[PDB]
Design an enzyme around this catalytic site. Structure first.
Site, mmCIF file in Angstrom:
data_model
loop_
_atom_site.group_PDB
_atom_site.id
_atom_site.type_symbol
_atom_site.label_atom_id
_atom_site.label_comp_id
_atom_site.label_asym_id
_atom_site.label_seq_id
_atom_site.Cartn_x
_atom_site.Cartn_y
_atom_site.Cartn_z
ATOM 1 N N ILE A 159 0.858 -1.180 0.000
ATOM 2 C CA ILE A 159 0.000 0.000 0.000
ATOM 3 C C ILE A 159 0.899 1.235 0.000
ATOM 4 O O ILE A 159 1.808 1.340 0.821
ATOM 5 C CB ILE A 159 -0.956 0.011 1.211
ATOM 6 C CG1 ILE A 159 -1.986 -1.118 1.053
ATOM 7 C CG2 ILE A 159 -1.640 1.369 1.336
ATOM 8 C CD1 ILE A 159 -2.943 -1.286 2.216
ATOM 9 N N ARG B 230 -2.265 -12.429 -0.707
ATOM 10 C CA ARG B 230 -1.056 -13.248 -0.836
ATOM 11 C C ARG B 230 -1.222 -14.690 -0.367
ATOM 12 O O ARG B 230 -0.598 -15.593 -0.927
ATOM 13 C CB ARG B 230 0.099 -12.619 -0.062
ATOM 14 C CG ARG B 230 0.599 -11.312 -0.643
ATOM 15 C CD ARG B 230 1.409 -10.562 0.395
ATOM 16 N NE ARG B 230 1.920 -9.285 -0.094
ATOM 17 C CZ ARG B 230 2.392 -8.313 0.688
ATOM 18 N NH1 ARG B 230 2.418 -8.462 2.007
ATOM 19 N NH2 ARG B 230 2.836 -7.182 0.157
ATOM 20 N N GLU C 43 -2.308 -8.992 2.560
ATOM 21 C CA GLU C 43 -1.838 -10.269 3.107
ATOM 22 C C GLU C 43 -2.825 -11.395 2.805
ATOM 23 O O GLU C 43 -2.407 -12.519 2.535
ATOM 24 C CB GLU C 43 -1.557 -10.178 4.612
ATOM 25 C CG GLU C 43 -0.531 -9.122 5.015
ATOM 26 C CD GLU C 43 0.902 -9.464 4.632
ATOM 27 O OE1 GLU C 43 1.125 -10.356 3.781
ATOM 28 O OE2 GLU C 43 1.823 -8.834 5.194
HETATM 29 N N1 LIG Z 1 4.447 0.863 1.616
HETATM 30 C C1 LIG Z 1 4.366 -0.284 2.265
HETATM 31 C C2 LIG Z 1 5.472 -0.827 2.904
HETATM 32 C C3 LIG Z 1 5.320 -2.021 3.578
HETATM 33 N N2 LIG Z 1 4.139 -2.625 3.612
HETATM 34 C C4 LIG Z 1 3.941 -3.890 4.296
HETATM 35 O O1 LIG Z 1 4.774 -3.919 5.422
HETATM 36 C C5 LIG Z 1 5.738 -4.940 5.366
HETATM 37 C C6 LIG Z 1 7.089 -4.395 5.753
HETATM 38 O O2 LIG Z 1 7.369 -4.783 7.068
HETATM 39 P P1 LIG Z 1 8.858 -4.806 7.697
HETATM 40 O O3 LIG Z 1 9.630 -3.656 7.134
HETATM 41 O O4 LIG Z 1 8.746 -4.696 9.169
HETATM 42 O O5 LIG Z 1 9.362 -6.090 7.178
HETATM 43 C C7 LIG Z 1 5.658 -5.515 3.956
HETATM 44 O O6 LIG Z 1 5.756 -6.936 3.945
HETATM 45 C C8 LIG Z 1 4.334 -5.048 3.402
HETATM 46 O O7 LIG Z 1 3.314 -6.048 3.448
HETATM 47 C C9 LIG Z 1 3.035 -2.055 2.957
HETATM 48 O O8 LIG Z 1 1.941 -2.621 2.944
HETATM 49 N N3 LIG Z 1 3.183 -0.892 2.302
#
Ligand SMILES: Nc1ccn([C@@H]2O[C@H](COP(=O)(O)O)[C@@H](O)[C@H]2O)c(=O)n1
Ligand SMILES: *[C@@H]1O[C@H](CO)[C@@H](O)[C@H](O)[C@H]1NC(C)=O
EC number: 3.2.2.22
Length: 246
Positions: A71, A163, A160
């Site tokens: 996102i 996925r 999620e």
């Molecule tokens: N812009 C972003 C950045 C990360 N994310 C979510 O957050 C997670 C990142 O978590 P960590 O950095 O703690 O690993 C990704 O796996 C993703 O699903 C997101 O949904 N949008």
């Protein structure tokens, strides 16, 4: 675009939404019958718009990067909101440009930073369709601390679930009652990149992972996933992060 309405929502309509979400993500190749997300997409085509409606019919539009299901930001009435990270700023060049103002949230979108902003780990944050209704409502009016928690709920109940079929099913079980995510849910979320990589590495390694992936199963037990015959690969995971992006 894809849409989901909490008003009248049930496990079926949520399932249809997650199906739409998956099918909106482009791919030219499947690896072990699992769609492989693209290495990159140029311009506005990189972002999927998800129209989410709370029980009262109020709506936000969430921008999702179609290469990794991350996102980037969202639109609430006439205000756009983006994570404080380069990928999201880039997204702000293409989506929600007609917003009257743009707020950059005081955190990136990664789980660690969101949990810090929210003041709790997502092990402690109930999720479900009611929680998603709350999340949408919270994001309608700016509150960065509240928004962190809402975004943790939002990410897990959309990206999620797209996925992993297990996660989709967990949210369906929480259609009318929130509950904190199972340890298995957390495990799969944390392992998506790793699993995506190993499934791709298995392609020229006779279905064998170059490096085993440790997961927690539905019974809180720590299993070791070592090849593509595992149920996680055959059953569960629905989208692969391209190894080019890992
Ligand atoms: N812009 C972003 C950045 C990360 N994310 C979510 O957050 C997670 C990142 O978590 P960590 O950095 O703690 O690993 C990704 O796996 C993703 O699903 C997101 O949904 N949008
Ligand atoms: C592959 O994984 C399956 C399913 O977990 C397991 O039963 C089996 O021992 C593994 N086989 C090989 C050759 O790695």
């Amino acid at each position: 675009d894809v849409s989901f309405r909490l008003s009248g929502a049930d496990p079926s309509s949520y399932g249809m939404f997650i199906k739409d979400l998956r099918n909106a993500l482009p791919h030219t190749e499947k690896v072990y019958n699992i769609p492989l997300l693209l290495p990159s997409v140029s311009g506005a085509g990189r972002y999927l718009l998800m129209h989410l409606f709370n029980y009262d019919g109020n709506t936000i539009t969430v921008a999702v990067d179609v290469t990794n299901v991350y996102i980037m930001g969202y639109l609430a009435l006439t205000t756009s909101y983006f994570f404080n990270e380069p990928a999201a700023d880039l997204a702000s060049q293409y989506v929600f440009r007609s917003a009257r103002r743009k707020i950059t949230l005081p955190y990136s979108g990664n789980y660690e930073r969101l949990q810090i902003a929210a003041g709790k780990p997502r092990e402690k944050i109930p999720i479900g369709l009611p929680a998603l209704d709350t999340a949408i409502s919270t994001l309608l009016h700016y509150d960065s601390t509240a928004a962190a928690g809402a975004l943790l709920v939002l990410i897990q109940t959309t990206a999620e679930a797209a996925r992993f079929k297990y996660i989709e099913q967990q949210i369906q079980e929480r259609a009318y009652r929130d509950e904190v995510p199972s340890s298995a849910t957390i495990s799969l979320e944390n392992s998506w990149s790793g699993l995506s990589k190993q499934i791709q590495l298995a392609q020229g390694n006779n279905g064998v992972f170059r490096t085993p992936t440790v997961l927690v199963d539905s019974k809180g037990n720590r299993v070791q996933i070592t090849n593509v015959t595992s149920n996680v690969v055959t059953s569960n995971i629905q989208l692969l992060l391209n190894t080019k992006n890992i």
